[PDB]
Amino acid sequence: METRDVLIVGGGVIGCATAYELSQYKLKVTLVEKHHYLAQETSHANSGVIHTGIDPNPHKLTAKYNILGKKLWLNTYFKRLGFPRQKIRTLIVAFNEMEREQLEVLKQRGIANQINLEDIQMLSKEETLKLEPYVNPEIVAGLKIEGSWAIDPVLASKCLALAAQQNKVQICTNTEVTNISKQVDGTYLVWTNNETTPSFKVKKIIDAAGHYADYLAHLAKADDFEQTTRRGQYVVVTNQGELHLNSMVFMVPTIHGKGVIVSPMLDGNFLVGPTALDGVDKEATRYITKDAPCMLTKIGKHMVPSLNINNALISFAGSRPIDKATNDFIIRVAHNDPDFVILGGMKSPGLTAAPAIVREAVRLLNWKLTKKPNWNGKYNLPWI
Ligand SMILES: Cc1cc2nc3c(=O)[nH]c(=O)nc-3n(C[C@H](O)[C@H](O)[C@H](O)COP(=O)(O)OP(=O)(O)OC[C@H]3O[C@@H](n4cnc5c(N)ncnc54)[C@H](O)[C@@H]3O)c2cc1C
Numbered sequence: 001m002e003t004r005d006v007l008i009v010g011g012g013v014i015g016c017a018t019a020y021e022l023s024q025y026k027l028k029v030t031l032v033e034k035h036h037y038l039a040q041e042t043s044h045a046n047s048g049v050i051h052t053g054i055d056p057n058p059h060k061l062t063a064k065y066n067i068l069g070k071k072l073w074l075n076t077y078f079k080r081l082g083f084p085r086q087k088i089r090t091l092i093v094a095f096n097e098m099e100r101e102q103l104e105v106l107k108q109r110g111i112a113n114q115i116n117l118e119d120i121q122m123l124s125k126e127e128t129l130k131l132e133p134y135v136n137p138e139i140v141a142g143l144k145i146e147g148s149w150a151i152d153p154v155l156a157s158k159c160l161a162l163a164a165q166q167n168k169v170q171i172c173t174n175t176e177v178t179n180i181s182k183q184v185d186g187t188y189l190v191w192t193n194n195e196t197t198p199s200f201k202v203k204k205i206i207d208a209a210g211h212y213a214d215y216l217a218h219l220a221k222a223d224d225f226e227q228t229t230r231r232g233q234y235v236v237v238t239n240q241g242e243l244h245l246n247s248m249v250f251m252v253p254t255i256h257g258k259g260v261i262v263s264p265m266l267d268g269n270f271l272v273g274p275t276a277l278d279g280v281d282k283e284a285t286r287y288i289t290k291d292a293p294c295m296l297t298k299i300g301k302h303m304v305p306s307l308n309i310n311n312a313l314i315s316f317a318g319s320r321p322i323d324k325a326t327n328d329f330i331i332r333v334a335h336n337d338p339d340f341v342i343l344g345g346m347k348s349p350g351l352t353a354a355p356a357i358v359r360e361a362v363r364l365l366n367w368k369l370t371k372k373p374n375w376n377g378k379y380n381l382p383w384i
């Protein structure tokens, strides 16, 4: 049985960035992940986009943490951590007059979420097709936003963890939390992999368990929020000849769901998707099906008609964990246990928001913390 200050449960990007942030303090920290490797779940199956903030409702935590999160990635995390990424602008395209006025709404949203005017540009049909000659010519309008990036979220999550690990954070994989009990004395005992006796005794739990973030709070008797799901399947295609894109192209999200794209990927291939299906089981959140490819053909070709979807390399899927009550991020202490911090409902744009989400996690522990004087935070993930 390890006694420790903080147990972080879940090794997606939220758990990993949390470990990184806490590694700068004098603390005994452990992170637990049920899989043999980190970032195998939602943080594996997403489009990797660092969103501008044009999209999320400005009154929600999604917008708030998008804004903070992105600044942190660009002006702090990218200076210290090496992993693949690239700067690439956002283009949202409209197909009729109703989608066209949605662009005007989106513009306003971006401004409300503090995007400078110089980054936003409404484009006519003609201007859009000049910028991106391979887009559907039946579009009527476009909205271009500079400032977005695309990263490999897997390599980023691992970089964060390795960085944390280098600064004395304990990372335990193949370790699934199966029971938690708060003690008379204020600490938790934690059982893993259904073992008989506890593996950990800790003062604080940071719940970053993705689709099981709700399960884990119910298990600690700490909060009773519930998540639902939205599963999205993608395809990656290659060998598209003369095809080029210098933007990530999006359908209007307001009409077609969040993050429906055709994007050029870091590896030179094109990502298409995703589909959308609500209410799949938690254990099914990454299952691919034979239904989805057909929807994917319609989505890709509507946006980039010269796309050949038979030139397909992989199919994969992921699901957004969605808080049932608020349809927003959950970033707070449990309502019924001030020592259990919840980072749940980590839907889009949780990746973009991550750094801000986890700094708030650190504050919600409500401790006077002492910095290690010899921390700088730098890690270059070797990759080629
Ligand atoms: C299709 C799709 C597209 C998206 N696109 C973007 C995008 O372009 N940009 C953006 O900003 N956001 C995007 N998002 C949102 C983003 O991917 C998620 O916000 C983020 O990955 C959530 O990370 P997480 O760490 O909370 O969850 P996860 O990555 O799911 O990790 C949670 C971890 O907890 C572990 N776990 C669960 N239960 C236990 C247990 N009891 N014990 C131990 N471990 C446990 C799991 O194994 C796991 O890996 C997208 C999401 C989806 C689904």
Ligand code: NI
Residues within 6 Å of the ligand: 058, 059, 112
């Ligand atoms: Ni407002």
